[PDB]
Design a protein around this ligand. Structure first.
Ligand SMILES: [K+]
Ligand SMILES: [K+]
Ligand SMILES: [K+]
Length: 225
């Protein structure tokens, strides 16, 4: 079924159209995912000029079908079960004492490539807050992403908190509320409650002259015994 599409390395493309406080931008990403290992390797470029928000604030928006589901949890992997037609992923992300992002994405195959196409709208940001002021460290914490069948028993409702390190040594919370709904109408796996355990490392390409982010991530499902 959809799980079979992920047994080796799969190319990824990401495209994001954003508008935060009227500052418009676009981001393109490319790389590969290896769900057997829960690994992602990607590079993202801002194709419109300078990114008006910090790269770390966009990590969660910029393919949870690449999470590693251990064998005893495979009946809980909604994300691969929806493929290849894919799913809609919607979020609101509330930055404590600052503005919010609202995002809508479609994640699906296009040919042999897994594509994440996103629209993002951010509003009510402070002009010199941590986000528009670029006051975040260039790194990423490790998180638990909590997953539960949705009310309609059609997709999943997801909740978690991201912690962004700030350059003054404090931490700013980004409270995530997420819904995923299959694009096709045939059966998908509806999971028992569980979570994903995430870790990420960010870097730069020394030869890349555009504003950009190199991202490597490891994600493993857990919380079923
Ligand atoms: K700054
Ligand atoms: K900075
Ligand atoms: K890390």
């Amino acid at each position: 079924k959809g799980e079979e599409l992920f047994t080796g390395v799969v190319p990824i493309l990401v495209e994001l159209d954003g508008d935060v406080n009227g500052h418009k931008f676009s981001v393109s990403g490319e790389g590969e995912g290896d769900a057997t290992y829960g690994k992602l390797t990607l590079k993202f470029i801002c194709t419109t000029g300078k990114l008006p928000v910090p790269w770390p604030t966009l990590v969660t928006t910029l393919v949870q079908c690449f999470s590693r589901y251990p064998d005893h949890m495979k009946q809980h992997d909604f994300f691969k079960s929806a493929m290849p037609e894919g799913y809609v992923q919607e979020r609101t992300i509330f930055f404590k004492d600052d503005g919010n992002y609202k995002t809508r994405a479609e994640v699906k195959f296009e040919g042999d490539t897994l594509v994440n196409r996103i629209e993002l709208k951010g509003i009510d940001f402070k002009e010199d807050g941590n986000i528009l002021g670029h006051k975040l460290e260039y790194n990423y914490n490790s998180h638990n992403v909590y997953i539960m069948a949705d009310k309609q028993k059609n997709g999943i409702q997801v909740n978690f908190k991201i912690r962004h390190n700030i350059e003054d040594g404090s931490v700013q919370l980004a409270d995530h509320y997420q819904q995923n709904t299959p694009i096709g109408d045939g059966p998908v796996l509806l999971p028992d409650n569980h979570y994903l355990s995430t870790q990420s490392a960010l870097s730069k390409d020394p030869n890349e002259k555009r504003d950009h982010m190199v991202l490597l991530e490891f994600v493993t499902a857990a919380g079923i015994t």
